[PDB]
């Protein structure tokens, strides 16, 4: 039993999560120009485009433009941006002054990269947002490019997130009261709907609020809750498997890694089925390790910072999982969520215990920190054999090796695929969405022999270290598929692109509902 | 309460060691070729010899042999093997083609080590047995040395283990599939009886299974439960003080270690009796840490794994004392196992904390890592103090120190003895059995001052590293015996020795009987 | 300098690596059929292939076929071997029995292999060899693949290795006395394979010596040498020649060292018109002690394996004359010793590059990138012509095996399909490779320093490292290039646990002869 004030606190921490919606809205310049005549809506306004787009006509047609704007077009600097004071000019608030942020974003873009740079725009509108008057206002801000979809990912993304703790907002939910309503204005009527580019910001921001919450609040119980929350509320179907029923049902992978813990492992799968013909059936998978301690092979302690990121497949596939629905994408989709706490105590599994997976293989584990893949080859035996169907395609998303930020960095997803179309697929849905992605070698017959033991089918960890550490992970994986499974698999290492400096990206679910958009 | 399926697996597992009987049957040439009427076993045989044996005339007479086994022994090279294939030779699977494998065992051998060179007879038949056409097979090992009990370990502990998780094993109580039934053929009617030498073979691979198996299957538990039904099968008396038992009873030493762990520590005696009169009363005690973690001195994870093998003292102790039962051996044995895991979590005894050991003197604890001599120092109290009479000689086996591999290696155990006499003849045994053995520095005057502590009687680590470390140790246990007891004390160091790089190697077992045997 | 006896040795050294010719010969089963007339080479043969064409008809018509090789065949487990005995069947040597030896290679290979997958070749038969009755004979390998270029490297690179110190071979300037004349036989010309095979095992030659044989000095000899014996230019700039013409970055790296560093470089014009310009450019590091941010000693192993780079665009060279491929190339080397005494370049000292821009030394073991930078920039500004195509080829990076392993080196590339002409040579040739992000907007901001144009290593660890050090080597590319630039990481794949492998020539031959 837990303290009844931590229960208290941690009720409403999901109510917060399962309530969540956006801050951002979206429309378009001459819809703008008629619905608020003119007004801009509050003391700052915000511009953001490439050299030349800034120096298009229709910017001067703009409502807040001005002899000093167009200097400030001049002495920005790419990348960067500038900020000049306006008197007078017509604004929703009365404000004497009205603050003019110019941000230049740039066209150069590698041929792995968004064309539109939406990582940029992110910068500059957080940079924009930093000046703020008075928080609980509408800031415009006015876009120039009309690639919409990064675009709108990318401002939900940026500026002050939307959990945190500081003055007494642990009181309100973690719910944070710094937030600006972010108005974005595109040059033209979108080409994808505002009540769809406000669930994709909202399943983007909603990511980003599961990966920020520390692992007191989002614990694999809460998570579920969260989980059986949406479910009641969009009406689709839930599937646990809570605890010591995970061992009794052959799952000894998720089981093994997660019974240390305070509270229990979960098995948690999520059903959507569109009305009319599915273009594909697919199966998400998500590493939920809520915080990856290291269990016995204990990390240390500069390592063992920042690991509540180590949730953040599974809120990638279950924000992703969530978009689709809301949208209504005609997907049929199956989203397994594997959660677990790897922690330290007298019922940790250990550095030479031997694992039955659901699969049937056995695992030897060399190190319990390596604990991710097996929490995954349960959760990609169930989506591939023990569902209502059998998918087409199995993407499976994890925060998974620190090899994956040596080979592809902070900005690209690793991928681990087993057919050169869906890598493709994947990759352009990267470029298009903005939450870019890159491959890593795919060679099974070179990451076999490094899991080879001595008493097990295979072991949790390589032989030799230097040998394509982000794919042979993925092999592991791939291991404990069912052989029913004939179709392709997507394995995502996003290690580091749930995260930068400010906390977490929100990185998963843009991807997935481009992804599917394209099928 | 464990789940329903994880107690399943565990009685099976019990069972499967219990009722453990061994793969190798043993014969002679003579007999052979009269049962068997020079028909052979299967489609592989082995011959196995030194150089100058290799080519004497009665190899020429051996019902495999032809022209082209004559090069193979000209083509090997010394320690290595060689392969031919002979077509239509005469055999039971009806092969159209028998696989004949020399190998040749060199006849260098130093003035510590078994002159017949077990350890090569090992790895050569191990080779062979890779080239396996069929499991659950029989494969005649025709060798050529006489020295029958050192070859009998050495096959025994060849090949693939009994233990194995691949393959569905996992189902079948970790008995592998894999594993062929040897028949040995001696040149002589063996010295000792057939009967004989399968106990001993079956006991070395008990002693294997054991220290193979992970610590999900092998707990305090189960191998206390393994010494009961020993006890129920061959009748003798079985003693168990268990978990908080051991602390009401001043049993402050192995309570203190274990009682962080799931499964609680236990303190096993078994006692056997031979019908006349004893040569000798001969006390054994084993270190039975059943995974050694660390404690709150937590081993890093490269040092933590493989530490399932922390309990191989106690499985050799145990597995000597089963064979001096089953064989009559005309000793009085007392076999007290020390079990326990050295586990990690709030109840872990610490890193400053003070115990009073069963033999009254306290112990400050300076590293919880070094918990092995603390367990054996109640060990060997009770067996000098607490039982039904005084050994003659207390041996005590364990997996105690790191820098025994340092000081004597992978193939020797380190012996720190009291006495010139009994040193010398545990070393003789050690030749004898193949098993073999080495002295570290005895030495107390030296080793007791690196104990000096400030509030109690001594501390359980050396002040100073590099000061006979193997040996300190060993100091340690000695001053936790009775003041009653004034024999023989041998302390055996067997760190290394109980594995390589397949696994378990059986050690222990065979070196006692040989030891008994000479009494 | 040095003693009258070490002179001896070094010379003797320079002259085995000049007059190095290979142990392989190549013919087919027809040709053999009539030449030997179906007397066996040796006491020893070999076979291997597939699952599928160990059981091909063909198979049973070759000239030591029996029952027992038949069943062999069945026994084998794939990726292994099984030998067995014939007796009395004909041969060169005479003796009563022959020794056959089957190997099974797998038919297994994902979208990023070689089909043939050569990798498992090469082992197949470096197990057979070790059963040789005797040295200085003829060991015939039937091969039944006929993916020739693959297979003539992979059986190059295949058993004892030509350099040796052992049993007195350091007195016979470390020419091997325990290699077989090897002569595979299939079911491109003979003089062609036979040439891909000698810079393979010139390549593994110069990687396996150790750096007190081959220094800096003793590597340009050798260059020098093949020079005079091939007929193409040679350029050497020695020393504080570097200092006083604007080379600071290889300068620097090498200064320290007791033999001073040199950027060697090589030219070749074809007589007709070229496909290509291209120009190569090597890392020559001959011992990578890692200078004053001085390695771990377990790191520190093996690091004669640095000047990896060089020895493949060399050896990748020296095949492209033998064989007269139709391509203009440059290939200039970066040699240098990073070592560690009272001249060592220091963490914090400043570089000027030859392209005239800042290097702000972070850590003295970042070496490499430095040392090419002037490489690069030499290539593509200081030549009588301006190349389509720059190769840079170093084994650079620890990240390199971590993101693409031991058997495929990582492309850092500027151009889709350049990147896709090399990756097909890869496939082609055995000798395999894989993309690393190429995304300079992102390597750049890693190397902001504060009072030097850049840094030499990356602010952040954990961010495409393999690709940030091929972006460094960029930035010292001249304005004048507007070509591809191809920067291959080749750390692993250039030595395996018996030694070096000789990975590089066969991947640049292959990808010449396809422009
Ligand atoms: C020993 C295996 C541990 C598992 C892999 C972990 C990641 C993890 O625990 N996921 O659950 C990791 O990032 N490991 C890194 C790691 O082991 N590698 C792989 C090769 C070199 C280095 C990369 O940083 C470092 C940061 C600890
Ligand atoms: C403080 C630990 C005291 C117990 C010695 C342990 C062995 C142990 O845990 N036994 O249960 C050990 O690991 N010994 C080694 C060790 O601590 N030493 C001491 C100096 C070098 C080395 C000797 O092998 C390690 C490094 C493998
Ligand atoms: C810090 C500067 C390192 C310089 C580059 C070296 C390799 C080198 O010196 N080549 O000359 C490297 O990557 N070394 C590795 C290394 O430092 N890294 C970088 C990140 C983690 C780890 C392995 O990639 C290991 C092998 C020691
Ligand atoms: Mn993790
Ligand atoms: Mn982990
Ligand atoms: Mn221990
Ligand atoms: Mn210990
Ligand atoms: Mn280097
Ligand atoms: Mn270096």
Redesign the interface.
Known sequence: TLPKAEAKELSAFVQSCVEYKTNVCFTDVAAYESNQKGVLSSGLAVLVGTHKQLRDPAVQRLPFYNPAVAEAIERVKEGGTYGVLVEGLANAAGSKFVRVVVGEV?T??????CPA?PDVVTXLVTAALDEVKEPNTTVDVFVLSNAVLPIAAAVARCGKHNFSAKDGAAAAAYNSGKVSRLQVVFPEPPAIPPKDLEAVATSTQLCQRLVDAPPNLLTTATFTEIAQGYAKALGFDVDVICG?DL??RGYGGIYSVGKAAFEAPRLVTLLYTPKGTPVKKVSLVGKGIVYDCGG???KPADYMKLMKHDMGGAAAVFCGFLTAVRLQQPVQLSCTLCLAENA???????????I?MKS?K?V?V????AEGRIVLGDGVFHATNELSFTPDVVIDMATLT??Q????????AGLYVNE?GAEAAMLRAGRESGETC?????????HEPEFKS????MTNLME????????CAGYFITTHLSPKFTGAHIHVDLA?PVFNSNGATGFGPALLTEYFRKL
Chains 1, 2 share one sequence.
């Open positions: 740039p150069k873009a590698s041929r792995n990269n740079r010591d061992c009794e016995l092979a204990l330290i105590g007298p019922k940790s599994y250990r550095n030479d215990d031997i039955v049937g056995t030897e060399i190190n319990t920190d620190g090899a930020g040596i080979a592809t960095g902070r900005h690209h050169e890159f491959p890593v070698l795919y060679c099974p017959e070179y001595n008493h097990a089918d030799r270290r230097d040998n394509a550490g982000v794919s580091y």
